[PDB]
Amino acid sequence: SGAIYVGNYRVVNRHLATHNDWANLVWEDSSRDLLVSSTTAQGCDTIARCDCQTGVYYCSSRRKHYPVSFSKPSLIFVEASEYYPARYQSHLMLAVGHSEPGDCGGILRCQHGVVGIVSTGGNGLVGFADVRDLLWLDE
Ligand SMILES: COc1ccc(Cl)cc1NS(=O)(=O)N1CCC[C@H](C(N)=O)C1
Ligand SMILES: [Zn+2]
């Protein structure tokens, strides 16, 4: 579990979004596994605007932060699950590192700010849903 709070926005994994998230929907994209809902309180997370390929992510299944090298956002095949059928998930970045399903929502950060959130994993890999292209999160 986990979310990004920027301005009057809450960014979460679409497969973990609550009734309140859907009742205050701003934008959602199942191909990216992202959902953005509105908030009453102001958010103070800074979103990165860069093409960094190194950063640090939080892994709740180990209560640790890990440094990683990750690929640029791209279309990656993701096997069928209880939330989605087998499909290509877009804007997804992969790294070699530990992850378990409950790790989804953990933030990936570079020196410029928040890059994305954990969205996939398995077989010694971890996938992150990129958020750097969503320029409207700032305005
Ligand atoms: C051992 O499997 C995991 C390990 C770590 C992690 Cl973050 C996840 C899994 N399962 S998973 O199949 O990647 N995952 C399940 C939840 C929805 C994801 C999606 N974005 O379509 C896909
Ligand atoms: Zn950066």
Residue 16 near ligand 1, beta carbon < 6 Å:
no
Domain residue ranges of the chain, discontinuous segments joined by +: 3-44, 45-139
35: left (phi over 0), alpha (psi -120 to 50) or beta: beta
CA atoms within 13 A on the CB side of 42: 4
Pairwise CA distance, residues 101 & 99, whole Å: 7
Which of 78, 94, 120 maximizes ligand 1 atoms within 8 Å of its Cβ, making it the mutation to test the pocket?
120
Q: How far is CA 120 from CA 20, 77, 131, 139, in A?
A: 24, 11, 15, 28
Contact 26, 37 (CB under 8 A): yes
Q: Is the alpha carbon torsion for 52, 116, 59, 94 positive or negative?
A: negative
Method of determination used here: X-ray
- Please state, in angstroms and as integers, the Cα–Cα distance from residue 131 to each residue in 22, 36, 63, 80, 116, following that order: 19, 11, 23, 23, 5
CA-CA-CA-CA torsion for 121, 49, 111, 14, nearest 10 degrees?
-30
**Can you tell me which residue has the tokens 């180990």?**
62
User: Does the Cβ of 122 fall within 6 Å of ligand 1?
Assistant: yes
**Residue pair 107/119 in contact by the 8 Å Cβ criterion:** no
